[PDB]
Structures are given as C-alpha cells and as structure tokens.
Symmetry: C2
Subunit: 136 residues, 2 copies
C-alpha cells in the first residue's frame, strides 16, 4: 500500500473514483481514459460529471461521449507536468517521484490561493454593492 | 517527507537514531558507518550499545571501536537483501522499492514468528514440567 496522499498517482485508484459515471462502454471519455488522463471523479449537485486532475487540480464538467480526456486536459491546462510523465508509476525513480509530488504540492497551493482570491473578489462585489446603496 | 514506516530507509534517519553512541570520531563503528550498514540504535538497559538492522532485523550488542559494521552485518545475517542494494535511495525505481519493502515485511514477520515460537516453546516446557511434578508424586 501507499500513504493515502500518493494513492491518486495510481491509475487504477483514479479509476475506482468513478462511481456512476454516465459515459461507459462505447465512448471516448470512458473511466479508464478519464483516469489515464489523470482525472478523478468528484460529483456535486449542479455538476454531476465534474472531474479533476489529481496533479494540477483543474476541474472540467460537461463531458460528452466523444470527448478525449487527454486533449481536453491539454486544452485546459497545458502546463501540467503529469501531462509529461511518459514513464509508468513503477518505472519512476524515488527521486523523480519526489520531484513530482512536490510540483503537485505547489499546484495544490496555487489552486487554494486562486480560490481564496475568487472569494475575496466576490466579497468585494458585495461590499461595493452595499456602500453604493448606502452612499445613495 | 516519506511516512514513518519508510523513514528507516534513509541513511540520515538511521544516523539520527544514534543517541549516546559511545564510538565517535576516532572509531571504526561510528554512527555513520553503522547507519551506512542498515543499523538503527535501539538500546535496552542490559545492553546500551544495542544495534538493529532496519531491514532484516538482526540485533547486535557489545561493539569495540574497531569493528566494521558492514563486516559484522555480512557475518551475522548474510541473507539480508539490503547488503545487495547498490543504488542510492533516490536512485531506486518505485518498483524496485516496493519490492524491497515487500521483502522487508517478510523479514519482520519471520522475526515475529520466531519470537512467538520461542515464547510458545518456553511456555510448553513449563506446562510439561508442572504436569510431570504432579503425575509423578501422586
Ligand atoms: Co465539449
Ligand atoms: Zn493536470
Ligand atoms: Zn540486515
């Protein structure tokens, strides 16, 4: 086994996160392909087909049977290292892996920082809204 | 920042396990040479210089300043896979690692199994004697 934090590096673990995925058997964006492209399944009320790259954390919804997880991945996050890892998990050296887990950790941080930023911006709109109604 | 169970694979972790190791600067079995050979410092009371291979689990106490940890280790446990690993830690592929780790768990179990055996054997000898002391005198 691997510590939980590094399990999503395993393709077969990423697959297993796909429970109740609509596009199965004869589609292009099959669970295996979603997985091979680094995607993990994480549904919500609004978006039920929401998927996220375990590495860069980009989120994509609105999938269609003809979609190719890999091109979609490129198209929305071309600066994602996982998109370069040519070797398979076992073929990597602890040094390469550790370098990767660290890029990922920065990635995480970047996403968390980008969210906190969106929220701040949202709060700003509200405060601006309030001051305006009040300044009237 | 690997998980605890895997930290002993790091020479530095093992080196740091040496607290109050008698042999320093001028000796052969220094902490580094000890760590370099897989040893970790787990001292008891009866034995303050107890050292154990993090991989096969063989223990060794009573070290003199001129002992070569690797030599000793090659003698008291020649089967230890770790004595074969030539690559540095970061130079190992995950497959090579995962396999080294699997075999280490086998080595642990094997140790636990023999303790359990010896303790069970000791218990049996006492039960056997106690029953004899009775079914003899009456
Ligand atoms: Co589309
Ligand atoms: Zn990505
Ligand atoms: Zn050993």
């Amino acid at each position: 086994t691997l510590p939980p934090a590094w399990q999503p590096f395993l393709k077969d673990h990423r697959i297993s996160t796909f429970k109740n995925w609509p596009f199965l058997e004869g589609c292009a964006c099959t669970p295996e392909r979603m997985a091979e492209a680094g995607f993990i399944h994480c549904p919500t009320e609004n978006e039920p087909d929401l998927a996220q790259c375990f590495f860069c954390f980009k989120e994509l919804e609105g999938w269609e049977p003809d979609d190719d997880p890999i091109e979609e991945h490129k198209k929305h996050s071309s600066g994602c290292a996982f998109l370069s890892v040519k070797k398979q998990f076992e073929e990597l050296t602890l040094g390469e892996f550790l370098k990767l887990d660290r890029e990922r950790a920065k990635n995480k941080i970047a996403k968390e920082t980008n969210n906190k930023k969106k929220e701040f911006e949202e709060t700003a709109k509200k405060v601006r809204r309030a001051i305006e109604q009040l300044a009237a």
